Structure formats: C-alpha cells, structure tokens
Amino acid sequence: ETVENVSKESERIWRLQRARTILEFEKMLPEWLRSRFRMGELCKVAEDDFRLCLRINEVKWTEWKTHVSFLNEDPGPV
Amino acid sequence: RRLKKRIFAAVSEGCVEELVELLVELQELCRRRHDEDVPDFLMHKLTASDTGKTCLMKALLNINPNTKEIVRILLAFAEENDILGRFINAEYTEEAYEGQTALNIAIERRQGDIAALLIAAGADVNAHAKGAFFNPKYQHEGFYFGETPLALAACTNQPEIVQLLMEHEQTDITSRDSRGNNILHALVTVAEDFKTQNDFVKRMYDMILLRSGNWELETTRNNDGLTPLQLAAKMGKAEILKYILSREIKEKRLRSLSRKFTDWAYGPVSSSLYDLTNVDTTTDNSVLEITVYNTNIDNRHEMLTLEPLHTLLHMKWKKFAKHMFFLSFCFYFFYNITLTLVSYYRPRGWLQLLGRMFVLIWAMCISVKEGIAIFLLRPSDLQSILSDAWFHFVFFIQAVLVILSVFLYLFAYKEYLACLVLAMALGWANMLYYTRGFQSMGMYSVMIQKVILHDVLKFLFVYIVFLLGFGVALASLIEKCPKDNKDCSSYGSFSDAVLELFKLTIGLGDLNIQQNSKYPILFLFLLITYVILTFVLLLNMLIALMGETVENVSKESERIWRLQRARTILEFEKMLPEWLRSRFRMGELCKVAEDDFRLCLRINEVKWTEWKTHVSFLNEDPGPV
Ligand SMILES: CCCCCCCC/C=C\CCCCCCCC(=O)O[C@@H](COC(=O)CCCCCCCCCCCCCCC)COP(=O)([O-])OCC[N+](C)(C)C
Ligand code: NA
C-alpha cells in the first residue's frame, strides 16, 4: 500500500534530495572557478535591459499562433 | 546611405504613411546615373547584402495590422520597376536559412491572405529551404518540415494554404528535398502522437494524397530507399501507419489508392481485404520486417496490434512457425538430454556413440547460427541486448562451452568438466525461451525479465553491500581460537562471516550467538541489525515492489510476448530456402478493373454500430468463393 502511494511521487522526492546535494557542492566551490553559470547577458529590452537567462526549447502542436512577440527575427541559434 | 536602414525600420514597425515617402525618394535616386544599370542598384539598396533579407521578407517577419498594406505597396513598387520576378523570389544567402523566401515566411506566419496574393504575383511555389536551420542535426536547434512551401503549410496545420498551393499549376507535388523526402515523407517525420498533435497530419496526409490521385507519390523512395509507408514503420509512427495500412477511399473515380478493400458486405457481417504488396516477407524491406527488428523505437508492441500486421503474423504462425518452433524445441530438448546423460554418466559405447556426436554437431550448428545472427543484428544499446538479443548470447555461450569442453577434453587440461557443467546449467536455463508461443507461459516469461531488471538486480546490489558490510564488521571482533578448540567461532574469517550471514538470510542452519567475540553484545547487535535490514526490510520490500511492477506490466505483457514471438516468426521464415514458399497469403485479387491485382489478406468483421448502405464493394455476391 505504501509502495503504491510513494512510487507515484518518489521520483520528485529523489530530485529534491539530489537538489540538496547540488547546492551543497556549489557552496564548496571557492570565489573563483565560478565560470559554469548560465547563458550570459541578453538584450531582452532595448532600454539597456540585460538579464542572465536560461534557454529552454519547447515544441507544441496545439495553438498555432502568430509569433509577433519575439526578440530576434532569425530563428537559427547564434 | 541611411535610406536602406530607414526603409527596413519603417517596414518593421508597420507604418504606411512614411513608407511611400521613403519609396519615392528611392525613385528620385533612380534618376541619378547609376553608371551600371537600374534594376541591380535598386535591388541592392532594397536588400541586405549580409543575409539576403529583403524589405518584403522583413514585413512578413514583423506581422502587423498594416502588414497587408505594406506588402501590396512593396509589390506594386517592384512591379513598376520590372523587378517583381527577382524581388518576390529572393532568398537568404547565408547557409543558416538558405533557400527561405518571402512565400515561406508568409506561410509560417499563418498569413493566408498575404500568401494568396504573393502566389498570384509570381512567387516561386517550388522553392527549397536548404538552410541549416530547416535541416537540423537535432530536434532543438531547428525545425524540419520538407523545406518546401507546400509541406510547410501541411506540417503547420494550414489546410487552406495547402489547398491553394495544390490547385496551383506550377506546384510540384512530387518534389524531393535534399534528404529525398517528398511531401508524404515530411508528414511522416513531422507526425507525432495524438496527445501531442490533434491528428492533423493524418487528415493532411489524406487530403494531399487524394489531390494527387496517383501511386507515384506513395511509392517514392528517399535517399535512404524508404517509402512513406516504410518510413512510418522506421520512425515508429503508429497513428500514420494505422491510417495507411487500413485506408478506404469511399468516393469513386479514385479507388486504387486505397490499401483496405471490402469485397463483399451483407448487413453487419463484412469481409475486408488488406493490401500486402509492400507489407510482407516477400519484399527485401517491408513494414512487417521493420516493425519487428526495429531498435530505435519503443512502441513496436503497439504497432503489431494493427489489423493487417496482427493477422499476418497469426496466419503465418499457424502454418509453418508453429511446427518449426515445436521442432526446434524437440531438437534442443534432446540436445540437453543427451548432453546431460553423457556428462552425468561419465567414466571416473559403440551403440551410444551416435548420441555423443549429436551434441558436438548440434553445438556447432548453434554456434554458427548464433554467430551470424548477432553479427547481422548489430546490437549497440544495453537495453537492446536484454530486449532483442539476450537469448542470442546465452544460447551462443552455452554452445561454445560444449565446444570449449571438447577442445580441453582432448588435451591434458582437466578444466573441461567445469565448462561442461556450465553448459548443463545454462542449457536447462535456456529452456525458458521456448515458453513463448503459449500466451500463459509467454506472458509469464516476459514478467520475469521486468522483475529481474527492475527489482531483483536493484535488490541484490543493496543486499550485497549489507552482506559484505556486516561481514567484515562481524569478523573483525572475533578473538583467535584457543589452542585446545580450533573451531571456537563460526565467524573465523571474512569468507566464513559472509557464509553464515548468507545462510541466516535464507533460513538455513542454526543461529549460535555464543561466538568467540570480545564484545558479545556488540556482535549480537550487528546480527540483529542485519536481520532487520535484510530479513525484515530488504526481503519483504522486494515482494511489495514487484507487485507494483506486476500491475504495470500485466496490462502490457501480452503485447510484449507477441513482439518477442513475432521476432521468432521472421527468423524461422528466413531459414526457409528459395523454394517451399507456397505458404503465402491469398493470391492476386482484381481490386480495380484496370489490371490492378494485389496480394491481399482477408479479414471478416462484424459491427452492429453504423448500419450503412454498402455501395463500395468489389463483389455483389456475399458468399465466399
Ligand atoms: C557475491 C560474492 C560476495 C563476496 C564473497 C566473499 C568470499 C570470498 C572471497 C574471498 C576469499 C579469499 C580469497 C582471496 C584471498 C586474498 C587475501 C590475502 O591474500 O590476504 C593476505 C593478507 O593480505 C594483506 O595483508 C593485504 C590486504 C590487501 C589484499 C587482500 C584484500 C583485498 C581487498 C580488495 C579491495 C577491493 C575490493 C573491491 C570490492 C569491495 C593473507 O594471505 P596468506 O594467508 O599469506 O595466503 C596464503 C597464500 N600465499 C602465501 C601464497 C599468499
Ligand atoms: Na530454516
């Protein structure tokens, strides 16, 4: 009975336990060697707005909207 | 100058009041002596040399409420300059988006009205977008759709543009891209599961195929030599494969394109004929062969449940496969029986020598057959070993052990008996392969594989850590036996400690806690901890964990057994020679009066649901003949 109740959520618990290890290891790193951050500054807004952003690509054949709220006209990564 | 930048900036924003003001200035510049020619200078100033992007393509990338007004003005401006042909057909020069034109951008932006006037203006409806983005190496840095405007609208769920493009006289439906894929191939690659796509590809596949009205598009092979029907099996698109395999075209004037035909129907009882020209073992590469031996997909068991595929396997199973499977079992059963008797009754004659030679000869036959079977299978992934070639190795390993034992027997090495015993234990363990063919035993066998991998292997890894972890600990606090009694403690060494704990786990022997331990309380504390961890925790939890896996597998183990059994059917059929292939399906049937004879499989179904009028049959008489 407990296995059935936990198996549907044990995957999330393992990631929660693993995520604790990731933060502990990152704190062990010194002031230097922190070159493993995410993508650098990106001009999100033309008004001198640069933010560190994480790139995630998703595919969804559901809505089929017109893209008029993008940042770069060229779709190819560069 | 800065005129080009201003034109692009005004075009992107979507303003037409100053758009004409910038264009009339360019017309004034045309009066200036270019010294080379008029059209080239105008095109150069109206296009970006770095990437090849034009102002018209800039507007379509920047769809605005006034974009349609901009497009007409730009086209009229180009038409007045007699550069309309080379302007609307301009494409990017960079390899990232090479071949992309204005028509491609408009279709992607879902601008049907804008794309409609572009085609009438003279847009190239056969442009190929051979850029790197349109043909990505992976599924994240690009989007492959067929690099053609006809396929782009098809893959983006835009039937209105597809109908407009197909009706155009200059559209090449059978056009092939760099991969050699046609329109139908691109839909197969684009097609996904129903939970992801709203079956628009299947509807789009039917619409485009009916418009062409010919088998040239369906029989086209790409650079990999695969038809769209074969590509669905190669990429594991069950939704597309199901439609194509069971395809009925009710409307007249075009019926040969169908793959499913009802020769007769009387009330709810009707018989269906499924085309098998490209789905059979007769051809070199077919859907049936691909859907069974595929290793890049994990939905083969679902793909074998289709109406033609499931029945085709069943029909050939009861003809030759059933007898060959039983014959193979009898030869292998006698192979192990004879091997066991000679090894068990070994010395420590002239009439039984034939049996001994049978084992040696049959071992060579297994070794040769399994040697090439693994070679042609090309196993790469670890899962493929345990899901497609596990019995191809253990049979090979057992066979070569007998050969190795014979090789060591004639020499002075006495290790031949050790290899001979391993052949016996593995040979009888290999009998579980023949459990297939029977639904009850076959589903039981596939249950064992999931239990072993998901639970047994996981359980053993933790148990060994506790077994060895407490083995060193318990043996550590053991004093040396006195000179009088040399067997004071059973936990004398590490090997002894593990053996006692192993017997404790399986409930064998007697638990004697009066060992020669300098800390008897500590020694007993670890023993009780080991029992709780193993006897109470690890052993009991394994039963509960497998019950979760049994529930998840029992709802799909039947399909897995058929998938495993179907692999045996194809292997047995390949063993047949060139002749003896008289066990095929029903012969040629006049599906269409235009000399159209196809090998078809007859399936009879009864359905008291729709109660339609049968006007799309092949034979008026319902009685079989
Ligand atoms: C599922 C299965 C479970 C396991 C089953 C376990 C039970 C079976 C396992 C084992 C039974 C015994 C077999 C091997 C015996 C070797 C011990 C030895 O020689 O010790 C010597 C002392 O050695 C030392 O003083 C050095 C210690 C390090 C080497 C030995 C431990 C290895 C650790 C590995 C670390 C990595 C481990 C990685 C994995 C954790 C004593 O030797 P001796 O008395 O002089 O020997 C007489 C002969 N001679 C004189 C010619 C030399
Ligand atoms: Na007992």
**Ligand 1 pocket mutation, candidates B464, B466, B494, criterion most atoms within 8 A of CB:** B494
What number of other Cβ atoms are within 10 A of residue B484's Cβ? Answer: 6
Crossing angle of helices B494-505 and B520-531, rounded to 10°: 50
Residues of B in contact with A74 (CB under 8 A): 51, 96-97
Where do we find the tokens 């499913």? B260
Closest CA to B534 of B460, B444, B616: B460
From ligand 1's centre to the CA of B494, what distance in Å? 9
Q: Reduce the DSSP state of residue B602 to 3 states and report it.
A: strand
Q: Are B526 and B469 in contact (CB under 8 A)?
A: no
The Cα–Cα gap between B254 and B82 comes to 44
If we measure between CA atoms, which residue out of B307, B315, B268 comes closest to residue B622? B268
Identify which of B504, B476, B508, B505 has the alpha carbon closest to the alpha carbon of residue B489: B476
Residue B67: exposure state from Cβ atoms within 10 A (0-12, 13-18, ≥19): buried
**How far is the C-alpha of B618 from the C-alpha of B261, rounded, in Å?**
8
* Chain B CB within 8 Å of residue A63 CB: no
Question: For residue B465, which ligand has an atom nearest its CA?
Answer: 1
Q: Which two tokens stand for residue B405?
A: 């034992």
Q: CA–CA separation, A46 vs B207, rounded Å?
A: 45
Number of other residues whose CB lies within 10 A of the CB of residue B304: 20
Q: Is the Cβ atom of B223 under 6 angstroms away from ligand 1?
A: no
Estimate to the nearest angstrom the gap between the alpha carbon of B283 and the chain centroid.
20
- In ligand 1, the atom with minimum distance to the C-alpha of B493 is 11
Cβ-defined contact of B109 to A67 (cutoff 8 Å) = yes
| Strand (E) or helix (H) holding B468 | helix B457-476
Which of A2, A61, A75 comes nearest B192 by C-beta? Answer: A61
Phi, psi of B270 (to 5 degrees): -145, 155
Q: Do B131 and A59 touch (CB under 8 A)?
A: no
Residue B441 has, within 13 A of its CA and on its CB side, a CA count of 9
- Identity of residue A17: Q
Phi, psi of A49 (to 5 degrees): -105, 100
b vs e for B544-556, b when ≥16 Cβ sit within 10 Å of the residue's Cβ? ebbebbeeebeee
Lookup: tokens for A58: 């998703």
CB contact under 8 A, B547 and A68: no
Residue B493 CB neighbour total at 10 angstroms = 12
CA terminus-to-terminus distance, chain B: 84
Residues linked to residue B266 through DSSP beta bridges, in sequence order: B269
Distance B222 CA to ligand 2 centre (A): 67
> Å from B547 to nearest chain A CA?
9
Q: Across the interface, do A76 and B97 touch by the CB < 8 Å criterion? A: yes
Q: Which residues of B203-235 are buried (b: 16+ CB within 10 A; e: fewer)?
A: ebbeebbebbeeeebbebbbeeebbbbbbbbbb
| Inter-chain CB proximity A62 and B545 less than 8 Å | no
Give the integer Cα–Cα distance in Å for B358 and B559.
37
Cα end-to-end span (Å), chain A: 52
Asked whether B70 and B16 are in contact (CB, 8 A), the reply is yes
Q: Whose CA is nearest to atom 6 of ligand 1?
A: B495
Among positive and negative, which fits the CA dihedral B494, B496, B499, B505? negative
Helix (H) or strand (E) holding A42: strand A41-45
HEC secondary structure over B500-546: HHHHHHCCCCCCCCCCCCCCHHHHHHHHHHHHHHHHHHHHHHHHHHH
Three-state SS for B587?
A: coil
Query: Which amino acid does the sequence have at B178?
Result: S
**Shortest distance, CA A63 to any CA of chain B (angstroms):** 10
Residue in A7, A66, A78 nearest the CB of B548: A7
Query: Which contacts qualify for B490-496: CB closer than 8 Å, 24 or more apart?
Result: B490/B515, B491/B515, B491/B517
Q: Tokens standing for B566? A: 């179907």
What are the chain A neighbours of B51 within 8 Å (beta carbons)? 74
Instruction: Verify whether the Cβ–Cβ distance A61 to B157 is below 8 Å.
Output: yes
Q: CA-CA distance, B146 to B564, in Å (whole number)? A: 35
Tokens of B188: 């197969």
- Cα separations (Å) of B396 from A37, B355, B423, B452, B526? 51, 21, 10, 21, 44
- Cα B371 to chain centroid, rounded: 25
Ligand showing the shortest atom-to-Cα distance for residue B510: 2
Do B146 and B195 form a contact (C-beta atoms < 8 A)? no
Please tell me the number of Cα atoms within 13 Å of B336 on its side-chain side: 18
> What is the sign of the dihedral through the CA atoms of A64, A66, A67 and A69?
negative
Chain A partners within 8 Å of B111 (Cβ): 66
| Contact criterion met (CB < 8 Å) for B142 and A76 | yes
Q: Return the SS3 of A25.
A: helix
Chain B contact for A5 (CB, 8 A cutoff): no
Q: Whose CA is nearest to atom 11 of ligand 1?
A: B495
CA pseudo-torsion sign B31, B36, B39, B44: negative
Contact in structure between B122 and A29 (CB atoms under 8 Å) = no
Contact B183, B209 (CB under 8 A): no
**What number does the ligand 1 atom closest to the CA of B499 have?**
7
Quick one: which ligand is closest to B503's CA?
A: 2
Alpha helices in B287-381 (DSSP H): 287-293, 300-303, 307-316, 322-344, 353-377
Taking the alpha carbons of B394, B396, B397, B402 in that order, is the dihedral positive or negative? positive
Q: How far apart are CA B101 and CA B54, in angstroms?
A: 9
Test B548 with A4 for CB contact under 8 angstroms: yes
CB-closest option in B141, B157, B544 to A3: B544
Placement of tokens 């996904």 in the chain: B192
In degrees rounded to 5, what are phi and psi of residue B266? Answer: -140, 105
DSSP letters for A41-70: EEEEETTTEEEE---------S------S-
3-state secondary structure B194-254: CCCCCCHHHHHHHHHHHHHCCCCCCCCCCCCCCCHHHHHHHHCCHHHHHHHHCCCCCCCCC
Ligand 1 pocket, mutate which of B462, B467, B468 (most atoms under 8 A from CB): B468
The radius of gyration computed from the CA coordinates of chain B, to the nearest angstrom, equals: 36
CA pair distance B46, B56, nearest whole angstrom? 9
Beta strand pairing call for B260-266 and A41-45: unpaired
Separation between Cα atoms, residue B245 and residue B230, nearest integer Å: 11
Structure tokens at B605: 């179904």
B495 lines ligand 1 (CB under 6 A): yes
Q: Using a 6 Å cutoff on CB, does residue B498 contact ligand 1?
A: yes
Tell me how far CA of residue B296 lies from CA of B74, B234, B498, in angstroms: 49, 8, 43
Nearest CA-CA distance, residue A20 and chain B, Å: 23
Q: Are B315 and B321 in contact (CB under 8 A)?
A: no
Of B63, B192, B548, the CB nearest to A3: B548
β-sheet bridge partners, residue A51:
A42
Which of B548, B550, B551, B553 should we substitute to test contact with A (largest number of A Cβ atoms within 10 Å)?
Answer: B548
- Neighbour order of strands in the sheet with B260-266: B260-266, B269-275, B596-606, B588-592
Rounded Cα distance between B593 and A67, Å, is: 51
Greatest extent of chain B over all pairs of C-alpha atoms, in Å: 123
- Residue B355's CB: how many other CB atoms inside 10 A? 14
